[PDB]
Amino acid sequence: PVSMTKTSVDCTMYICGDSTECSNLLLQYGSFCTQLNRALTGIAVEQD
Amino acid sequence: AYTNSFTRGVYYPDKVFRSSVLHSTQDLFLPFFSNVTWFHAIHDNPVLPFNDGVYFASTEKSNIIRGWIFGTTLDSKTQSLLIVNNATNVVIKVCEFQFCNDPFLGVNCTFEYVSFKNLREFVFKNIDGYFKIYSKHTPINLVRDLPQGFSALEPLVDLPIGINITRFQTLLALHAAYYVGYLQPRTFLLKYNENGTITDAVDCALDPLSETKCTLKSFTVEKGIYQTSNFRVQPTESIVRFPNITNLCPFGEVFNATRFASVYAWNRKRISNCVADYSVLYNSASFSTFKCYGVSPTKLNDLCFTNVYADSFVIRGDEVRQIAPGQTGKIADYNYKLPDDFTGCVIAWNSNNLDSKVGGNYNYLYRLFRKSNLKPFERDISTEIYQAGSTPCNGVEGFNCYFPLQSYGFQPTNGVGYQPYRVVVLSFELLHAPATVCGPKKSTNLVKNKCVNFNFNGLTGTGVLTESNKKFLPFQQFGRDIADTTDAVRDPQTLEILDITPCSFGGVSVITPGTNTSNQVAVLYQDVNCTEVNVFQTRAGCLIGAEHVNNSYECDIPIGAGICASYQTSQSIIAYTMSLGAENSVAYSNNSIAIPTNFTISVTTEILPVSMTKTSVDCTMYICGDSTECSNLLLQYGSFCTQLNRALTGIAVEQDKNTQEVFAQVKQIYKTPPIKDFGGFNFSQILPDPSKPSKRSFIEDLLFNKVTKFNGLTVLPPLLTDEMIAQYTSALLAGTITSGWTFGAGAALQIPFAMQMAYRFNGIGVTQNVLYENQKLIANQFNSAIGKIQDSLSSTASALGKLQDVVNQNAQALNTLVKQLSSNFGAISSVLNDILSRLDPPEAEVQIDRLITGRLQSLQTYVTQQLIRAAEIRASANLAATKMSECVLGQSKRVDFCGKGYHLMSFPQSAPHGVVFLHVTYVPAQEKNFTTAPAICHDGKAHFPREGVFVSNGTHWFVTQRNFYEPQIITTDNTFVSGNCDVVIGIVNNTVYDPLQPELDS
Ligand SMILES: *[C@@H]1O[C@H](CO)[C@@H](O)[C@H](O)[C@H]1NC(C)=O
Ligand SMILES: *[C@@H]1O[C@H](CO)[C@@H](O)[C@H](O)[C@H]1NC(C)=O
Ligand SMILES: *[C@@H]1O[C@H](CO)[C@@H](O)[C@H](O)[C@H]1NC(C)=O
Ligand SMILES: *[C@@H]1O[C@H](CO)[C@@H](O)[C@H](O)[C@H]1NC(C)=O
Ligand SMILES: *[C@@H]1O[C@H](CO)[C@@H](O)[C@H](O)[C@H]1NC(C)=O
Ligand SMILES: *[C@@H]1O[C@H](CO)[C@@H](O)[C@H](O)[C@H]1NC(C)=O
Ligand SMILES: *[C@@H]1O[C@H](CO)[C@@H](O)[C@H](O)[C@H]1NC(C)=O
């Protein structure tokens, strides 16, 4: 295997999809969405 | 009259000093380069919407504009402020002043305070009751309109009025040029300088440039692809689909029955074919207590449940808290037990008057004695006499004989907690029965191929509703997927299978070149079909902004599905099928050979992250910095942070081990000779310069120059400082300049650099004779190639990509740790001295525990992230150690392992937490077509070369090495005799000249 499936799983919509209140409570955790999205993006560009 | 609001309107969201740091906040500013209205001051004061604010600017020469009135009615009906400056006093009052018929200044008194060449900007506003006076006076040389320039707008005075303003009217002076920008709750990338003046700002929700600007946290964005947010097709309307129920449900019957059951025999009234509004329930104010455990106490009317139970039984006032999960007592253990996962809602209204006889209500029973505690939602009708003592009864009294059921005497003369009630615990359940009890919300038509807000029988979501062929059985109602989410539903009014699929969604990514190159904007909608959104549709999605090009180019900013975007010609953004290269068919046949007549020595900079900043956090200092209570509460987790400290110190020691394995493979001190008579190969740019104060290379100096805390986490200094890392690199360079591969294995053997290149040439199967034949030429090419390294390494910032990105990666890891010191994690504050200094210790274990589980989980993500990052660094560092061992400390025969081309050697160069290798490679340049045959037959015997390839230019046959055209006549010290000419295909007639033949003939 040279690559996995290039999953681009977004933090806010995966955890609180189609929701504003849950995304507001989730951004109160600080950066976990931005380093998780950067981690998935780094994974995707790593398969590329 | 419209104006481009160029740069004006930036103020301080807060007045906390910051330096060389970019803070992002949500606040009310007007957008940059936006549309603002242009006014004159001849013969205009309409009441504009100050919905959340505007920005004022004045071109003034005689002080005509002098005041403002802001408010919601602005007619002394509400509290409205007036501003006058009578050349000596500043007067800002909201008191009941006499305003004129047309409000001007000449040329509810609760707030108890009673007393061109100039651009004036004033923003009077209210945020949370603060009245901020924002002021700035700025000289200019400009007359046409508002100037282009940056101006921080600072607060001066905060006054206690706290006034609603939704629309405002300017104040004139009778015997006003201004601008109106509608502010929005937008997020803003703000820049502070070291002197504390806000020098720039970005409204970053405006255009793709600014969206990249505040997602990359920088005012200058590199050319590339960046995901900024998510695109979701918003529902345009709401569809409600409920069964065609026509009967009002007897909820009022189980509230207003002539009699209610006891807790000994409470009823299960099961409900189907009903409409439940609950609006009459909430409109009734009779509820004494409403402890609604599974579902919201207020938000229930729109919700639909599958089945409901009315568990009506009468119990005392002090016992109303015992109808709860986890509660115990006589009633909770002997009469009615609720499960710990009870999903429902408990009802009890103020009801002393109805289920209470004036002579005593005697018909309600309860169980006070039982040998075992009862089960959740079971019904026990058993009347067996409870066994208390020792001897049994044959229906008599005495020992072991009381009736286990006895009744309440309900009289109005009882105590206030002992009062009778019509408590009726409507034991709601959310199960997955056929959903019947829905709020009315009259239905609408079934839309197709358009995602809207649907609520099918209490099940909500977003998606399109299409017809399906999915053959339901008549009892079955809902569909599920492999991921057990809802796949199909049946419309409960018309019996049709409705497929549910959420519409096209996805993150938005942005194509943008450098801001130092362009400001042209582009957006990408991936996996969206170009209906629901100079528009291009591809397999990757809907691309808006770039014109589609049938001509194919090399990929610069990747898009997806083979599409790539770039910036070219007059320049513009283009979209195209990306090239896989130049379309170059090879000139194959059975007899076609290509061998290069010319070569070049190319040098490639394989730069490798070998090491990392030895970050080490402290259980005390980082997690619970200078706090005895928090350090104790972290040791409450036991050895947990101790293996974290062990792991981080392990990362430090193995980083030292990586550096030792790549550099201190050398056992001695090697120093360069005072003369650099290196056979034409000047190394004073790659070798340390004695004229330099620190003995490092010149290219290392540009690797130190062009490419380059105290708050609980420290950095450990390396065991190897930068100067003596440079000393080890100088040692490795010296060993591979005067000693080559020998000092890697054993004793230092002095070997010339000409010998190293000549023998390294042999390694890749090209003969070393070419090197001494063109020594001056390749000295020129290699020196100028190192000069091209110097030029590229000094000109392009992208040449340091693989170390700049990793040093930045560690920087963002540390920076996210730093940002968790702002993150609250559910605690009310993020600074630990603040949270400890204001919380009493018993609730401080709770607050500190939330903060440290958040801090420790973020630190856990951090330490695992650098554990896998140090695994990547250590994999690339064992790669670097084998690279140095086989490519510096020896010659590698691994093709394409030491950069593109036939590897010759490599030159270590120290760099900030990394190694730069100067891999010299052999790359062929110019080639010719020749005719070739597998073998040459000479005297009935087939001939094969020991080294090299048979070729012919069409006139004479030659044997030549596979990577350089050196034609010689076929000679038996280059070929050998084998086999016969009758078997091999493609063999040609020739003669093979034995070098022994002229010796024996002469
Ligand atoms: C900020 O303050 C320093 C300190 O006097 C001053 O020298 C400088 O000119 C100011 N302005 C800047 C850095 O733009
Ligand atoms: C109830 O809904 C069904 C939908 O199929 C419809 O055919 C029927 O006429 C409706 N009846 C009333 C009284 O609204
Ligand atoms: C995109 O929408 C058009 C509009 O009708 C349609 O013809 C085309 O099939 C769609 N593309 C895909 C991949 O379904
Ligand atoms: C082959 O091409 C290289 C390219 O620079 C040149 O330096 C060299 O002199 C050429 N050799 C011959 C034999 O033409
Ligand atoms: C050193 O390298 C420079 C290249 O800038 C060259 O001009 C000079 O002749 C070299 N000196 C020696 C002694 O090789
Ligand atoms: C394949 O090789 C044979 C023998 O060298 C030759 O006769 C034949 O023409 C070749 N095929 C082509 C397409 O040239
Ligand atoms: C030359 O090659 C041919 C095959 O094409 C072979 O039959 C013959 O014996 C060879 N030698 C000669 C003609 O001397």
Side-chain angles (χ1 to χ4, degrees), chain B residues 538-575:
Chain B
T538 180
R539 195 43 182 190
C542 199
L543 186 55
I544 296 172
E547 184 176 5
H548 176 214
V549 178
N550 59 343
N551 193 7
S552 184
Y553 315 98
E554 190 276 331
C555 187
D556 289 2
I557 296 183
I559 294 172
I563 312 301
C564 287
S566 164
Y567 205 59
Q568 270 92 23
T569 65
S570 178
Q571 320 277 9
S572 158
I573 44 175
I574 56 177

Coordinates of all heavy atoms in Angstrom, one line a residue, chain B residues 538-575:
Chain B
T538 N -15.7 20.2 -13.0 CA -14.9 19.0 -13.2 C -15.3 17.9 -12.4 O -16.3 18.0 -11.6 CB -13.4 19.3 -12.9 OG1 -12.6 18.2 -13.2 CG2 -13.2 19.8 -11.5
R539 N -14.6 16.7 -12.4 CA -14.9 15.6 -11.6 C -14.6 15.9 -10.1 O -15.3 15.4 -9.2 CB -14.1 14.4 -12.0 CG -14.6 13.1 -11.4 CD -16.1 13.0 -11.4 NE -16.6 11.8 -10.8 CZ -17.9 11.4 -10.8 NH1 -18.8 12.0 -11.5 NH2 -18.2 10.2 -10.2
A540 N -13.7 16.8 -9.8 CA -13.4 17.2 -8.4 C -14.5 18.2 -7.9 O -14.7 18.2 -6.7 CB -12.1 17.9 -8.3
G541 N -15.2 18.9 -8.8 CA -16.3 19.8 -8.3 C -16.5 21.0 -9.2 O -16.2 21.0 -10.4
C542 N -17.1 22.0 -8.5 CA -17.5 23.3 -9.2 C -16.4 24.3 -8.9 O -16.2 24.7 -7.8 CB -18.8 23.7 -8.7 SG -19.7 24.9 -9.8
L543 N -15.7 24.7 -9.9 CA -14.6 25.7 -9.8 C -15.0 27.0 -10.3 O -15.2 27.2 -11.5 CB -13.3 25.1 -10.5 CG -12.1 26.0 -10.3 CD1 -11.8 26.1 -8.8 CD2 -10.9 25.3 -10.9
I544 N -15.0 28.0 -9.5 CA -15.4 29.4 -9.8 C -14.2 30.3 -9.6 O -13.7 30.5 -8.5 CB -16.6 29.8 -9.0 CG1 -17.8 28.9 -9.3 CG2 -16.9 31.3 -9.2 CD1 -19.0 29.2 -8.4
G545 N -13.9 31.1 -10.7 CA -12.8 32.0 -10.7 C -11.8 31.8 -11.7 O -11.3 32.8 -12.4
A546 N -11.4 30.6 -12.0 CA -10.4 30.3 -13.0 C -11.0 29.9 -14.3 O -12.0 29.1 -14.3 CB -9.5 29.2 -12.5
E547 N -10.6 30.4 -15.4 CA -11.0 30.1 -16.7 C -10.4 28.7 -17.1 O -9.2 28.5 -17.0 CB -10.7 31.1 -17.8 CG -11.2 30.9 -19.2 CD -10.9 32.0 -20.1 OE1 -10.2 32.9 -19.7 OE2 -11.4 32.0 -21.3
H548 N -11.3 27.8 -17.6 CA -10.8 26.5 -18.0 C -10.0 26.6 -19.3 O -10.3 27.3 -20.2 CB -12.0 25.6 -18.3 CG -11.7 24.2 -18.8 ND1 -12.5 23.5 -19.7 CD2 -10.6 23.4 -18.5 CE1 -11.9 22.4 -19.9 NE2 -10.8 22.3 -19.2
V549 N -8.8 25.9 -19.3 CA -7.9 25.9 -20.3 C -7.7 24.5 -20.9 O -7.4 23.5 -20.1 CB -6.5 26.5 -19.9 CG1 -5.5 26.4 -21.0 CG2 -6.7 27.9 -19.4
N550 N -7.9 24.3 -22.2 CA -7.7 23.0 -22.8 C -6.2 22.7 -22.9 O -5.8 21.5 -22.9 CB -8.3 22.9 -24.2 CG -7.8 24.0 -25.1 OD1 -7.2 25.0 -24.7 ND2 -8.0 23.8 -26.4
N551 N -5.3 23.7 -23.0 CA -3.9 23.5 -22.9 C -3.5 23.0 -21.5 O -4.0 23.5 -20.5 CB -3.1 24.7 -23.3 CG -1.7 24.5 -23.6 OD1 -1.2 23.4 -23.6 ND2 -0.9 25.6 -23.8
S552 N -2.5 22.1 -21.5 CA -2.1 21.5 -20.2 C -0.8 22.0 -19.8 O 0.1 22.2 -20.6 CB -2.1 20.0 -20.3 OG -1.8 19.4 -19.1
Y553 N -0.7 22.3 -18.5 CA 0.6 22.9 -17.9 C 0.9 22.0 -16.7 O 0.2 21.1 -16.3 CB 0.4 24.3 -17.5 CG -0.2 25.2 -18.6 CD1 -1.6 25.5 -18.5 CD2 0.5 25.7 -19.7 CE1 -2.2 26.3 -19.5 CE2 -0.1 26.4 -20.6 CZ -1.4 26.7 -20.5 OH -2.0 27.5 -21.5
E554 N 2.1 22.3 -16.1 CA 2.5 21.6 -14.9 C 1.8 22.1 -13.7 O 1.4 23.3 -13.6 CB 4.0 21.8 -14.7 CG 4.7 20.9 -13.7 CD 4.6 21.5 -12.3 OE1 4.6 22.7 -12.1 OE2 4.6 20.7 -11.3
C555 N 1.5 21.2 -12.7 CA 0.7 21.6 -11.6 C 1.4 22.5 -10.6 O 2.5 22.2 -10.1 CB 0.3 20.3 -10.8 SG -0.9 20.5 -9.5
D556 N 0.7 23.6 -10.2 CA 1.2 24.5 -9.2 C 0.4 24.5 -8.0 O 0.9 24.2 -6.9 CB 1.3 26.0 -9.8 CG 2.3 26.2 -10.8 OD1 3.0 25.2 -11.1 OD2 2.5 27.3 -11.3
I557 N -0.9 24.7 -8.1 CA -1.8 24.6 -7.0 C -2.8 23.5 -7.3 O -3.7 23.6 -8.1 CB -2.5 26.0 -6.7 CG1 -1.5 27.0 -6.3 CG2 -3.6 25.8 -5.7 CD1 -2.2 28.4 -6.0
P558 N -2.7 22.4 -6.6 CA -3.5 21.2 -6.9 C -4.9 21.4 -6.5 O -5.2 22.0 -5.5 CB -2.8 20.1 -6.1 CG -2.2 20.7 -5.0 CD -1.7 22.1 -5.5
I559 N -5.8 20.9 -7.4 CA -7.3 21.0 -7.2 C -7.9 19.7 -6.8 O -8.7 19.6 -5.9 CB -7.9 21.6 -8.4 CG1 -7.4 23.1 -8.6 CG2 -9.4 21.6 -8.4 CD1 -7.8 23.7 -9.9
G560 N -7.7 18.7 -7.6 CA -8.3 17.4 -7.5 C -8.7 16.8 -8.8 O -9.0 17.6 -9.7
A561 N -8.7 15.5 -8.9 CA -9.1 14.7 -10.1 C -8.4 15.1 -11.3 O -8.9 15.2 -12.4 CB -10.6 14.8 -10.3
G562 N -7.1 15.4 -11.1 CA -6.2 15.8 -12.3 C -6.3 17.2 -12.7 O -5.7 17.5 -13.8
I563 N -7.0 18.1 -12.0 CA -7.1 19.5 -12.3 C -6.1 20.3 -11.4 O -5.9 20.0 -10.2 CB -8.5 20.0 -12.1 CG1 -9.5 19.1 -12.8 CG2 -8.7 21.4 -12.7 CD1 -9.3 18.9 -14.3
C564 N -5.4 21.2 -12.0 CA -4.5 22.0 -11.3 C -4.5 23.5 -11.8 O -4.8 23.7 -13.0 CB -3.0 21.6 -11.4 SG -2.7 20.1 -10.4
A565 N -4.3 24.4 -10.9 CA -4.4 25.8 -11.2 C -3.1 26.5 -11.0 O -2.3 26.1 -10.2 CB -5.5 26.5 -10.3
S566 N -2.9 27.6 -11.7 CA -1.7 28.4 -11.6 C -2.0 29.8 -12.1 O -3.2 30.2 -12.3 CB -0.6 27.8 -12.5 OG 0.4 28.7 -12.7
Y567 N -1.0 30.6 -12.1 CA -1.0 32.1 -12.5 C -0.2 32.3 -13.7 O 1.1 32.4 -13.5 CB -0.6 32.9 -11.3 CG -1.2 34.3 -11.3 CD1 -2.6 34.5 -11.3 CD2 -0.4 35.4 -11.3 CE1 -3.1 35.8 -11.3 CE2 -0.9 36.7 -11.4 CZ -2.3 36.9 -11.3 OH -2.8 38.1 -11.3
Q568 N -0.8 32.5 -14.8 CA -0.1 32.8 -16.1 C -0.9 33.7 -16.9 O -2.0 34.1 -16.6 CB 0.3 31.5 -16.8 CG 1.7 31.0 -16.4 CD 1.5 29.9 -15.3 OE1 0.5 29.3 -15.1 NE2 2.6 29.8 -14.5
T569 N -0.3 34.1 -18.1 CA -1.0 35.0 -19.0 C -2.1 34.2 -19.7 O -2.0 33.8 -20.9 CB 0.0 35.5 -20.1 OG1 0.5 34.4 -20.9 CG2 1.1 36.3 -19.5
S570 N -1.6 41.0 -17.7 CA -2.0 40.0 -18.6 C -2.1 38.6 -17.9 O -2.8 37.7 -18.4 CB -1.0 39.9 -19.8 OG -1.4 38.8 -20.7
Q571 N -1.5 38.5 -16.8 CA -1.5 37.3 -16.0 C -2.9 37.1 -15.4 O -3.6 38.0 -15.1 CB -0.5 37.4 -14.8 CG 0.8 38.0 -15.2 CD 1.8 37.0 -15.9 OE1 1.4 35.9 -16.2 NE2 3.0 37.4 -16.1
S572 N -3.3 35.8 -15.2 CA -4.6 35.4 -14.7 C -4.5 34.0 -14.1 O -3.5 33.3 -14.3 CB -5.6 35.5 -15.8 OG -6.8 34.7 -15.5
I573 N -5.5 33.7 -13.4 CA -5.7 32.3 -12.8 C -6.3 31.4 -13.9 O -7.3 31.8 -14.6 CB -6.5 32.4 -11.6 CG1 -7.7 33.3 -11.7 CG2 -5.7 32.8 -10.4 CD1 -8.7 33.3 -10.6
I574 N -5.7 30.3 -14.1 CA -6.2 29.3 -15.1 C -6.5 28.0 -14.4 O -5.9 27.7 -13.4 CB -5.2 29.1 -16.2 CG1 -3.8 28.7 -15.6 CG2 -5.0 30.4 -17.0 CD1 -2.8 28.4 -16.7
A575 N -7.4 27.2 -15.0 CA -7.7 25.9 -14.6 C -7.5 24.9 -15.8 O -8.0 25.3 -16.9 CB -9.1 25.8 -14.0

